[PDB]
Amino acid sequence: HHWGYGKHNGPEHWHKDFPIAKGERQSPVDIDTHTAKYDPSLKPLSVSYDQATSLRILNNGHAFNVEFDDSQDKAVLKGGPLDGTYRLIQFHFHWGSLDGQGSEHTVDKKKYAAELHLVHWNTKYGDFGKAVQQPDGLAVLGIFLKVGSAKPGLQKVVDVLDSIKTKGKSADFTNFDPRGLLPESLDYWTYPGSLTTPPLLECVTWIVLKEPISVSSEQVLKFRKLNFNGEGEPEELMVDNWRPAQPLKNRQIKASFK
Numbered sequence: 001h002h003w004g005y006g007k008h009n010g011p012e013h014w015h016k017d018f019p020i021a022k023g024e025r026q027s028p029v030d031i032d033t034h035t036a037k038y039d040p041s042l043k044p045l046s047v048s049y050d051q052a053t054s055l056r057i058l059n060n061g062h063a064f065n066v067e068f069d070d071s072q073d074k075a076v077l078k079g080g081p082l083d084g085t086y087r088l089i090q091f092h093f094h095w096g097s098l099d100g101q102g103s104e105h106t107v108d109k110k111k112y113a114a115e116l117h118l119v120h121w122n123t124k125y126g127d128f129g130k131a132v133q134q135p136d137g138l139a140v141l142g143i144f145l146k147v148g149s150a151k152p153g154l155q156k157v158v159d160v161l162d163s164i165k166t167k168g169k170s171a172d173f174t175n176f177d178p179r180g181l182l183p184e185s186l187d188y189w190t191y192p193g194s195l196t197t198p199p200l201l202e203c204v205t206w207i208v209l210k211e212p213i214s215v216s217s218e219q220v221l222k223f224r225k226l227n228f229n230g231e232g233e234p235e236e237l238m239v240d241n242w243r244p245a246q247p248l249k250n251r252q253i254k255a256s257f258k
């Protein structure tokens with residue numbers, strides 16, 4: 001009886017195994033655009049992905065993860081609210097059963113069809129396992145997906161999903177360039193928060209881009225053909241793998257922009 005996104009094991013249940021679920025800096029949150037303050041001291045974000053080395057794509061029973069070689073400073077996130085250098089380790093998405101839901105963060109209570117998380121760890125903690133124990137261990141770059149025009153840079157992801165339909169399946173996934181998933185603008189909101197799944201550790205600087213990317217109906221439909229279950233188990237479609245908005249509590253969301 002492991003955590004998941006069903007009626008009996010979903011987000012309202014997680015606090016029983018992970019009491020930090022009701023903590024002081026939980027993610028995601030609603031971004032009230034009128035209450036977020038412009039912080040003219042925030043530096044522009046630095047996204048250096050030109051040497052990014054993708055290795056593998058994995059269905060972990062909760063989402064699919066595209067994993068990167070993070071054994072050197074290849075793909076890094078710096079500037080914005082961050083002190084130091086954060087190394088890209090993996091990306092994944094959260095998505096809905098319908099185009100009207102799927103994102104974890106909301107903007108004035110608006111839900112997007114999906115949300116991309118580019119996950120980075122602080123290189124002063126040496127490994128991701130150490131970083132998740134620190135209040136400034138991770139920086140997650142969050143990008144909203146809306147349904148409209150196709151995102152050409154996503155199609156290589158969409159087309160390998162047949163090969164990792166069920167929990168525990170992995171496939172080689174080399175030479176994938178995550179710059180193809182970025183919107184034009186790097187305008188962002190930032191706040192201190194948490195992992196959005198168990199173990200819900202309060203180790204994340206969230207950096208949420210204002211500008212969504214557009215993906216096609218056919219592209220998101222392929223996300224929705226994935227399975228939460230293992231091979232040879234009854235089919236349960238991988239949909240609505242998103243946690244809802246958590247209380248902001250004693251936090252301010254800052255904007256990089258007016």
Ligand SMILES: NS(=O)(=O)c1ccc2c(c1)[C@H]1CCC[C@H]1[C@@H](c1ccc(O)cc1Cl)N2
Nearest residue numbers: 117119132138140194195196197198199201
């Ligand atoms: N939706 S998200 O981007 O907020 C997110 C949610 C859950 C997890 C991650 C990212 C990644 C990133 C850091 C820890 C890691 C993971 C975990 C797995 C195995 C481990 O041994 C440790 C950890 Cl903590 N859990």
Ligand SMILES: [Zn+2]
Nearest residue numbers: 092094117196
């Ligand atoms: Zn995530």
